[PDB]
């Protein structure tokens, strides 16, 4: 992850930098808290 | 009743807000039913319907051209917007713009009347003639029998006024101006400078008329000597590219503080027609320079002992006098001359 | 002296294909791109049809091949060697006639001056009296002219005026007449133009003489 | 008709929701033309868009994955030349008038004084232009100080 | 100063009763002292006063000498010279005996043989001299004299004085029938500026000269366009004859113009204008 775009309070809209492939934006979901999920470190993006 | 009229007013205001929202909705409709194309560049006009187009940062296809397009307009190097699915030439697109040329041309604030060039009325005559007259009213040249001139040297001491002299004509013509600090053309690569010059002249040949003003031709303008260093030979190559590329309605102004270094070929009358020698102001011109920079007794008294130099020294006179009347102007010129020396 | 114009002539009088390139175009920033471009030019010309490659300004690449003790000059030398090898190498060409123009024929490499690659070595000297007369006639054509003009004086007056500056003489005489509000140029108008083109440098520190 | 218009607000909202499936792509907004945009997707492709609107030519923008749509004397003098013009700009212009290099041996405190005045503290013409683009600016090698 | 302007009246009186050279000499000395002191106001006032004294006098062969000398004296101030020439021309314009006033006009011309600060006054004096000469039963040389001003470089105050200079150049060139020069000057002029508030007599005149030039040349479509601009000019649309003459000329020159795409287009536009007066002649 590269940024959380301030998390916009709700709707965090994180930014991801899938290596050698692309950079995208994501909501993630299914985790406990939008902030304790992650700030700037490795993460596992779902396929589709 | 007035209450019903006010109800009508609020109804109309609500309908106007909803009209703004109708604009938003049609924007959304266009977005939904629009899809982006693929940017590429033609490489060869194959059979009338087949065009070999190279998708930039990708492969090269053979594609078809849709109905409403100018096959004649479509030429090698032209940008094109192919369709994503059927890879058909949806429509052409203007040639690429280099970042350097973009910063060079599209950002050029020029607004100065000839009245703001106090002296140099003659040099104005020659410049304005060579640049403007072939552009506006070329039938004069056609009737005379002479081919229109292209460019002029416009060399002179460091600040007698060259950038301003070119800016005035550029503003009057309101054509495409392209100003270069030629000392920035130099590059640490081995020909990127020649590439930049070629791209500049292609920019000019595209949108015409166009005035190309190159300052400090001393660099990128030196006599070629046999066995200089690698950098010197690269600079000579950049000169040589400029010389050869240097065709229609693209007039040219140079600006330099030295004609000695200039290559004889670069000074050839076929490349630089008129060699103007704007010179440090003489008291006669200096007086009107001060007058125009007045943004008469004091002016004459100042000119009496004025240290005319660099042109901008008189703007310095005026600005310092403001920073501080006849005596105030006189002491301002005293101070600026003392500082300059 | 009118060599690029002679190349422009061919191209308006040649049935064969024409490929005009600039001696400085062959140079490139990336390694090997210059040789690749030279090979591409020659192969394209060979394959298309009877072709004429006008490499104007050849001295940008071809200069004497000295040790060069560096990178960029060695890349330039490789451009030159590729040009030599394509012009006359193992795979001989046919109907790929080549024309190249330079302002300084002394610096060019001695291998790219070899009968078989450059077997003409045409010189374009500054106009003589007779060529000056011919140029003046050709230019003063398509031009209203005063009956009192004596082009013979200008032609005979020994100077170093080239074709380009003769054209400039006529052109600025034309503009002087236009500013003087007249479509028929007088001898005063020429005399002015002739002075302003000769541009005789002076102030030469006199002790040299 | 206002109720039908509200229903059309609803259809617009659901259109936005469906077309805003969040997993977008990010692309440069390189180039900008009109008769539009020429985006450069992060995956090393460049794609034209007729319909996306004042995006900068170079901004990083989201895009649809599929449709691809978007020294007491010295300190006094410096305080003068820096602060007073900023406040009394009109006072300077009253008469009709309109770079400040600082000298000092290594460690004299030029950087310290600039920090005390502070605003941008940038430490070549490219850097010049960018720094003055992004306001007090200090340029070690809008309010200009060098 | 107060002393200067209270001692000037006594010199004026003495000159009025007659002072061939004493008043001139004392005024010259006073001017020398003031100029050395760098008193431009005193210089201007003394010069204007002395020229006025001469003008009140007979001054025949004297005022010209006085002004010429005063101008040729030491490095007088340019503002003082400008004021002197302005007052001189203002007095000159109201004079009779044209053959003799020619001497004073020539004196002004000679003192303004060329100087960046006497340009506009020199231009006006040259125009006046040309007008006088052409009135004096000879314009073949007045046209040439007027065909010297570089008004474009001069840059008069507004686009009125130098535009009038150019229009008078055209008038003299057509009076002498010098059509190449008239046409070149027409190309020099830019017609757009005639679309202004008071550019009515100027525009009518300019178009009239262009029309006469094209009449001599032989074209008809350009003459059609010229009458079209004239008619579109509102003022010629302010009297029955004043506008019907213009419309009739427009129609007749349309007809004279040879058949062509442009000829047909202009015919259609003039026919559809609908203001053809339905006169039983031109409409049909
Ligand atoms: N022999 C000639 N006859 C007529 N005009 C000539 C002649 N030679 C030169 N000119 C004029 O000079 C212009 C420039 O000539 P040209 O570019 O062919 O010269 P060049 O020697 O190749 O120059 P460069 O060394 O600058 O490349 C021509 O367009 C023409 O205007
Ligand atoms: N004749 C003139 N009239 C008014 N200003 C002048 C004149 N000559 C020089 N200047 C002033 O001198 C400055 C010269 O700047 P510039 O033209 O950029 O460099 P250069 O003088 O080397 O061409 C201008 O800012 C201009 O105001």
How would you explain this protein's 3D organization?
The structure is cut from a larger assembly and holds chains A (about 50 residues), B (about 350 residues), C (about 210 residues), D (about 150 residues) and E (about 280 residues). The radius of gyration of chain A is 10 Å and the shape is globular. Chain A has one helix and two strands; from the N terminus they run E-E-H. The longest helix of chain A is centred in the C-terminal third of the chain and has 4 residues. Chain A is mainly beta. In chain A, strands 1-2 form a two-stranded antiparallel ribbon. Chain B is built from eleven helices and nine strands. Chain B has a five-stranded mixed β-barrel. Chain B is extended. Chain D has about 150 residues and is of the alpha/beta class. Helix content of chain D is about 40%, strand content about 20%. Chain D is built from five helices and seven strands. In chain D, the strands form two sheets. Chain D has a four-stranded antiparallel beta sheet with strand order 3-2-1-4, with no helix packed on it. In chain D, strands 5-6-7 form a three-stranded parallel beta sheet, covered by helices on one side. In chain D, strand 2 and strand 3 form a beta hairpin. The longest helix of chain D has 18 residues. Chain D starts with a helix and ends with a strand. With about 280 residues, chain E is mostly helical. Helices cover about 70% and strands about 0% of the residues of chain E. Chain E contains 15 helices and no strands. Chain E is elongated and about 80 Å long. Chains in contact: A-D, B-C, B-D, B-E, C-E. The interface between B and C is large, with 39 and 44 residues. Bound molecules: adenosine-5'-triphosphate (ATP) and adenosine-5'-diphosphate. The site of adenosine-5'-diphosphate (ADP) has 18 residues of chain B, from helix 5, helix 8 and helix 10. Adenosine-5'-diphosphate binds next to helix 5, helix 8 and helix 10 of chain B. It is classed as nuclear protein. The entry lists the keywords proteasome, nuclear protein. The entry is titled "M2B Midnolin-Proteasome (translocating)".
Task: Summarize the largest interface: chains and residue counts.
Answer: B-C, 39 and 44 residues
Oligomer: part of a larger assembly
Main beta-sheet strand count, sense and barrel state of chain B = 5 strands, mixed, barrel
Along the chain, the helix and strand elements of chain B come as: HEEEEEHHHEHEHEHEHHHH
Order of helices and strands of chain E: HHHHHHHHHHHHHHH
Q: Estimate percent helicity of chain B.
A: 40-55%
Keywords:
part of a larger assembly; 5 chains; A: 48 residues; mainly beta; two-stranded antiparallel sheet; 1 helix; 2 strands; C: 209 residues; mainly alpha; elongated; binds adenosine-5'-triphosphate; binds adenosine-5'-diphosphate; 26S proteasome regulatory subunit 6A (chain D); protein-macromolecule adaptor activity (chain B); proteasome (chain B)
Entry summary:
Chain C has 209 residues and is mainly α.
SSE topology sketch:
The structure is cut from a larger assembly and holds chains A (48 residues), B (341 residues), C (209 residues), D (146 residues) and E (284 residues).
Chain A: E1 14-16, E2 24-26, H1 34-37
Antiparallel strand pairs in A: 1-2
Chain C: H1 4-9, E1 17-22, H2 33-48, E2 51-56, H3 72-87, E3 98-101, H4 129-140, H5 151-156, H6 163-179, H7 187-198
Parallel strand pairs in C: 1-2, 2-3
Helix pairs in contact in C: 2-3, 4-6, 6-7
Chain D: H1 2-19, E1 25-28, E2 37-41, E3 45-49, E4 60-63, H2 72-87, H3 89-93, H4 110-117, E5 120-122, H5 125-133, E6 136-139, E7 143-145
Parallel strand pairs in D: 5-6, 6-7
Antiparallel strand pairs in D: 1-2, 1-4, 2-3
The structure holds adenosine-5'-triphosphate and adenosine-5'-diphosphate.
Adenosine-5'-triphosphate (ATP) sits between chains C (1-5, 103, 135, 138, 163-164, 167) and B (265, 268, 270).
